[PDB]
Amino acid sequence: SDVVNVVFVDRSGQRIPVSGRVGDNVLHLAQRHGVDLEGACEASLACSTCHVYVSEDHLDLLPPPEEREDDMLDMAPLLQENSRLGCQIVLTPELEGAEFTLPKITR
Template sequence: GQRGAEPRLLCARLEPSGGAGAGPLGPERRPLPPHSGGGPSPASERPSPRHKASRFLHSGGGGSGQSEDGKRDPESEDDVVNITFIDRSDRRIPVRGKVGDNVLYLAQDNGIELEGACEASLACSTCHVYVNEDCYDKLPTPDEREDDMLDMAPLLQMTSRLGCQIILTRELEGMELRLPKATRNFYVDGHVPKPH
């Protein structure tokens, strides 16, 4: 890759607060069918992720931790997590989030075109993002369901994650999330996403 081509933004080195994970997804969460298909799993063709940093308790995704209107302000400046999205035209979009925010919902609340067709039920890869390397190493290891969905994402990279599975912690201050040039939208179990 071209990792040296751009200046690298380092994430803040802060201690985890312990309860940074978000709650359950809610009633719309559906389990995925077991992996099926012949031949080797695409996961075997992808290099395994490198995880050097300590892990946090991770609930596997979930609600945004926001009020119904999605616009609750952080309770204190200690809860603020500043991140930057880089859209498909390389435009940098700074976003002020808070500890516990789900990256998919935070992007959507700020007008960033991160689709999330399955509404964070781990049934698609349309919220696929590239995480800057320093922050990628601070994220919890993707679970098997997220890995299965990432295997279907086009343009997969070593730092690929699903935005719906990234929950902001103070340690992710300065995180950069690049949107891939393409995503693959498909329907699972007849689910039809709501229009945006």
């Protein structure tokens, strides 16, 4: 299959299951499904508005962050060990069941 199921957890705590596809950008997918994850810099590693928390079980299956991602995340409110920039995440079968939680506050 090319299907990759994920769940967005919105800022109110509502879980929003989404049937994505391999190769989908997590930011763009969220926006297609009415999830208020905004990407101020249009996926150019120059903001942190796309900040999400990734389920711990899937965090180590993602590409290691670029130094610019670390720089942007360091500026983000409510940073966690499992924080990533959503625009840097592309769906693969390894992210089946991954949960992307929107932080309460954005920069």
